[PDB]
Amino acid sequence: MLPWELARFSIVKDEVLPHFATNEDLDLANEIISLFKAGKKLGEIDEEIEYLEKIYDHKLVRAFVKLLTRLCEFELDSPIPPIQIRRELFKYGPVLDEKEREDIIQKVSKKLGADIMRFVFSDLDEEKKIIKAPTISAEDLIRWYNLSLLQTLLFKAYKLTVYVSSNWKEIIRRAKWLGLMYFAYDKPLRFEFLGPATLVKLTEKYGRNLAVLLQFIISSQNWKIEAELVLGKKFKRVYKLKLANFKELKELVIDEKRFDSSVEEKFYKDFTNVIKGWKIIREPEPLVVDNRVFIPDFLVEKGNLKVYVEIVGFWTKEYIKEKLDKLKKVKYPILILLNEELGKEKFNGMNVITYKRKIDISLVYKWLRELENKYLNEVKVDYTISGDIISLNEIASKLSLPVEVIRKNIKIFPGYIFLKNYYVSEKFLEKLRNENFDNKSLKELVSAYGDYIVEVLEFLGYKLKWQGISDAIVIKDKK
Amino acid sequence: GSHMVYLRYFKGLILSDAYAPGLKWSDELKAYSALAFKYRDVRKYFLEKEIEVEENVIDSLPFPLIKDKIELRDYQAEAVKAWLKEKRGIIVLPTGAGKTQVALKIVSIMKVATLIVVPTIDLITQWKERINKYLDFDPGIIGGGEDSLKGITVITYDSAYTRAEELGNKFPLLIFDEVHHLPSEGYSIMAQLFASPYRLGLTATPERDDGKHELYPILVGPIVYRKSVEELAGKYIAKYKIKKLYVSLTNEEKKRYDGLRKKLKDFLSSRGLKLQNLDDFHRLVKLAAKDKEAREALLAWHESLNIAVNSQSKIEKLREILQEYKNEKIIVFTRDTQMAYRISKTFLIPVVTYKTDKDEREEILQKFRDGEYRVIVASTVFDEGVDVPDATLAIVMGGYGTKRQFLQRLGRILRKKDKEALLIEIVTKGTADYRLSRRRRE
Ligand SMILES: [Cl-]
Ligand SMILES: [Cl-]
Numbered sequence: 014m015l016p017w018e019l020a021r022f023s024i025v026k027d028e029v030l031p032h033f034a035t036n037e038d039l040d041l042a043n044e045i046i047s048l049f050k051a052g053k054k055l056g057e058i059d060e061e062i063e064y065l066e067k068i069y070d071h072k073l074v075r076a077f078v079k080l081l082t083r084l085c086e087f088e089l090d091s092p093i094p095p096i097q098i099r100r101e102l103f104k105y106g107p108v109l110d111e112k113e114r115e116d117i118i119q120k121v122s123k124k125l126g127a128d129i130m131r132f133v134f135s136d137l138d139e140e141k142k143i144i145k146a147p148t149i150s151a152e153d154l155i156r157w158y159n160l161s162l163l164q165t166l167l168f169k170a171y172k173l174t175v176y177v178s179s180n181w182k183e184i185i186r187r188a189k190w191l192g193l194m195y196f197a198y199d200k201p202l203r204f205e206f207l208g209p210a211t212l213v214k215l216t217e218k219y220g221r222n223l224a225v226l227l228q229f230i231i232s233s234q235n236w237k238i239e240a241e242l243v244l245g246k247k248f249k250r251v252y253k254l255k256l257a258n259f260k261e262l263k264e265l266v267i268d269e270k271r272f273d274s275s276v277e278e279k280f281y282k283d284f285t286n287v288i289k290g291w292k293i294i295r296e297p298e299p300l301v302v303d304n305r306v307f308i309p310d311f312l313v314e315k316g317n318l319k320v321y322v323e324i325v326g327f328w329t330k331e332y333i334k335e336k337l338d339k340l341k342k343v344k345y346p347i348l349i350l351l352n353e354e355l356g357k358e359k360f361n362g363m364n365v366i367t368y369k370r371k372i373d374i375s376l377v378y379k380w381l382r383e384l385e386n387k388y389l390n391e392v393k394v395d396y397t398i399s400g401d402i403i404s405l406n407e408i409a410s411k412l413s414l415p416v417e418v419i420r421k422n423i424k425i426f427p428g429y430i431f432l433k434n435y436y437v438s439e440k441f442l443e444k445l446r447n448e449n450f451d452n453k454s455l456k457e458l459v460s461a462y463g464d465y466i467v468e469v470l471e472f473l474g475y476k477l478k479w480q481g482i483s484d485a486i487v488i489k490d491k492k
Numbered sequence: 493g494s495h496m497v498y499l500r501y502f503k504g505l506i507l508s509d510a511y512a513p514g515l516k517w518s519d520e521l522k523a524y525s526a527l528a529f530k531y532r533d534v535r536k537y538f539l540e541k542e543i544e545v546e547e548n549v550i551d552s553l554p555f556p557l558i559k560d561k562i563e564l565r566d567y568q569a570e571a572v573k574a575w576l577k578e579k580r581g582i583i584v585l586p587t588g589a590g591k592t593q594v595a596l597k598i599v600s601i602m603k604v605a606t607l608i609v610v611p612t613i614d615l616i617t618q619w620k621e622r623i624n625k626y627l628d629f630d631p632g633i634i635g636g637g638e639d640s641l642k643g644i645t646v647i648t649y650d651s652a653y654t655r656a657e658e659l660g661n662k663f664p665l666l667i668f669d670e671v672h673h674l675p676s677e678g679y680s681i682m683a684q685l686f687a688s689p690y691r692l693g694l695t696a697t698p699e700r701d702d703g704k705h706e707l708y709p710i711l712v713g714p715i716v717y718r719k720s721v722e723e724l725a726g727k728y729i730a731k732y733k734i735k736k737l738y739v740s741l742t743n744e745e746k747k748r749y750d751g752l753r754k755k756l757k758d759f760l761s762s763r764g765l766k767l768q769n770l771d772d773f774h775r776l777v778k779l780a781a782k783d784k785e786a787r788e789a790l791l792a793w794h795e796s797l798n799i800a801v802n803s804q805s806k807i808e809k810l811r812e813i814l815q816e817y818k819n820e821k822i823i824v825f826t827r828d829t830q831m832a833y834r835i836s837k838t839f840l841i842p843v844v845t846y847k848t849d850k851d852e853r854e855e856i857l858q859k860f861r862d863g864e865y866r867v868i869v870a871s872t873v874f875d876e877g878v879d880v881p882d883a884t885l886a887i888v889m890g891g892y893g894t895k896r897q898f899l900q901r902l903g904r905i906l907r908k909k910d911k912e913a914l915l916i917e918i919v920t921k922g923t924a925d926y927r928l929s930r931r932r933r934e
């Protein structure tokens with residue numbers, strides 16, 4: 014909310030060095046604070062500070078004035094719309110003598126029933142009047158500047174990396190509350206929030222959100238952040254804004270700590286009742302693929318199947334696209350819920366369910382039930398305790414089912430290893446290695462053990478003959 | 493059949509199946525073609541050679557219903573009839589002689605859609621008003637934040653150039669107020685992009701130091717009637733009367749005025765007192781960075797000139813003049829904006845600042861033009877407010893100084909009216925009069 018035309022900073026190499034206020038700027042801070050005393054027009058504050066606009070930096074002077082004004086309390090608006098006061102009052106044209114002037118004031122003051130003179134220009138900021146003087150110290154004015162300036166540069170940020178180690182849990186769901194757009198990584202454990210440069214229409218409200226999350230990060234024992242600012246019209250170029258555990262930063266905005274969301278808490282609830290086939294976990298453990306954390310909102314489970322769900326705050330075409338492609342290495346289905354905002358026709362996706370104001374558990378099911386109707390390929394759970402060995406045909410024989418349906422649905426059991434066309438308990442196989450038959454032929458010795466050649470083949474087997482029975486040159490050997 | 497040649501307009505150009513003097517084939521355009529302005533002479537060519545055309549060039553806007561409320565003077569009526577023989581060329585008169593009336597009478601005669609192109613925004617206001625009074629029609633505007641396209645339209649030279657292809661074939665008549673700007677390298681192309689056959693030029697200074705005014709015959713036409721100021725020197729207001737009154741400070745003001753002034757006389761002289769030199773002024777500024785008493789020194793100097801510029805006597809002098817001239821509408825100019833509110837609150841007259849809602853400003857201006865309000869205050873400091881309404885008298889109070897550019901605009905904005913104008917300027921006889929009156933600047 015501080016104007017760009019008032020942002021003052023410097024550039025060396027690839028870093029944007031902000032011209033923060035120091036204690037060299039206290040005489041300045043004092044003289045301006047001294048001027049905001051009760052019963053004074055701030056329009057005439059602008060005339061007073063002209064001489065200070067010359068002796069110091071005009072960007073620093075005005076920026077203080079705007080900040081102090083914001084914390085003053087003024088006479089509230091007139092009971093009559095000031096446009097109509099002037100329309101009715103100025104009807105008598107030029108009136109010269111004070112007694113006729115005194116007549117006309119009384120005349121319309123009765124016609125409208127209020128003190129015309131005190132309110133005639135109440136709507137114009139020039140003709141305001143300070144009732145409660147600001148209570149800011151000349152020193153807290155300087156820290157509050159250095160945060161207003163800090164939040165101003167960030168408002169033109171490509172992205173914003175927040176390096177965090179201990180406060181990992183809190184700042185995330187607060188950002189999720191605030192509805193930001195971001196990618197998380199695990200090499201330094203950073204969060205690369207998308208800066209308000211990405212948004213276009215509601216950027217002023219997005220940047221205010223990011224501005225809120227910043228404030229929670231500065232009020233900590235140790236913190237580090239890096240923002241990317243894109244500067245230049247004819248010759249654009251990215252610069253760095255690095256700042257870590259900085260001192261001069263005090264906020265005079267109260268966020269009111271609403272500490273809950275209207276759509277988020279309505280999501281965890283609306284699903285618990287209207288979709289009972291699934292048993293949802295509140296906050297899945299953070300998945301990490303390719304040194305990057307992909308925090309999902311919640312995971313839902315229809316028995317064996319488990320899918321991740323994430324409801325997003327702010328949307329943009331490139332963000333969802335980049336995310337699902339990044340989550341294309343998640344090895345599990347996902348569903349993403351997006352608030353109805355500027356971005357249109359963004360719900361035309363496999364995971365895109367675009368809500369409007371709150372969570373509609375109804376619309377989730379039509380996809381949630383579609384993903385299991387689409388998984389209509391018969392997979393029947395089966396157990397096998399090997400007598401000596403388990404046969405796939407045997408597993409088919411017991412079940413009174415054709416062999417094929419088992420062959421398609423082959424399952425892996427922690428007990429055994431699957432040599433083709435059979436199973437073998439890993440204890441039975443580990444001992445059969447100690448048997449240690451070097452080479453054989455004619456398949457006569459296979460009958461004594463009575464299993465498949467598949468078991469023999471895995472350890473040390475080779476054959477140069479396709480035929481098995483009454484088949485010449487059958488022989489297996491180690492070499 | 494094969495006895496019809498095509499002649500069409502296309503994005504500022506003229507296109508044709510058959511050759512004509514001025515055209516040149518384009519493989520890119522697949523026709524003989526040139527810029528749109530050659531439309532008039534090519535049409536007459538084809539017509540003279542008795543060649544049948546399928547003409548599609550001018551897609552006119554409808555010429556509206558008007559009432560000609562204009563009764564010209566002798567030389568003015570000679571001006572219209574001079575242009576009418578060829579319907580192309582530059583009329584030349586000095587300021588106030590009625591260049592607008594000459595044009596708007598031609599408008600009433602031609603009865604074709606007309607675009608009127610003007611250099612500045614102050615001129616859009618003048619032209620808009622005069623088309624309402626003299627033709628009883630509110631014209632469309634392209635410029636000044638306004639985008640309306642009507643049978644009669646006022647437009648800037650810049651918007652004209654920006655939109656030339658869009659509007660090239662829409663107005664048969666084309667007026668260029670202040671035409672000497674037209675030969676400039678940029679507007680040269682702007683002129684050529686319109687197909688308009690009938691084109692009028694108006695100027696008091698037809699001649700151009702660049703020598704580029706030799707482009708007139710190919711862009712608008714030659715000068716068709718000229719009279720110098722001496723050549724007629726009558727039947728129009730020949731100047732605006734300036735009166736520069738000085739008023740003395742208040743008893744209570746003069747006291748604090750000198751005391752602060754004497755506190756500087758002692759301190760500034762104590763260490764390096766050099767004045768009226770700009771380099772010395774920054775010397776005090778650089779010193780005041782660290783010295784607490786040096787900043788106070790510069791504070792008092794500002795406080796002294798402030799007590800001068802905003803002298804409550806200057807307001808008291810306004811009551812005298814407003815009382816003593818009540819024949820017609822008066823417009824008070826003040827550089828300062830908070831000081832303008834004083835004038836409003838005291839005399840119960842409407843104020844206009846740069847931060848005034850366009851809705852409000854419309855009321856305060858349209859009621860002024862109508863004649864519900866008699867006297868109005870204005871403060872054109874930051875957002876330069878063009879001298880929107882014409883009147884009989886204007887008071888300027890800018891004590892520290894008036895931009896002669898700004899000062900001269902008030903003259904020309906008043907000069908065009910048919911009645912003599914009076915311009916008062918109230919300077920306080922204190923620091924303002926002592927420092928501003930040193931250099932005459934005439
Ligand atoms: Cl050809
Ligand atoms: Cl020449």
Ligand SMILES: [Cl-]
Nearest residue numbers: 767768769770
């Ligand atoms: Cl000087």
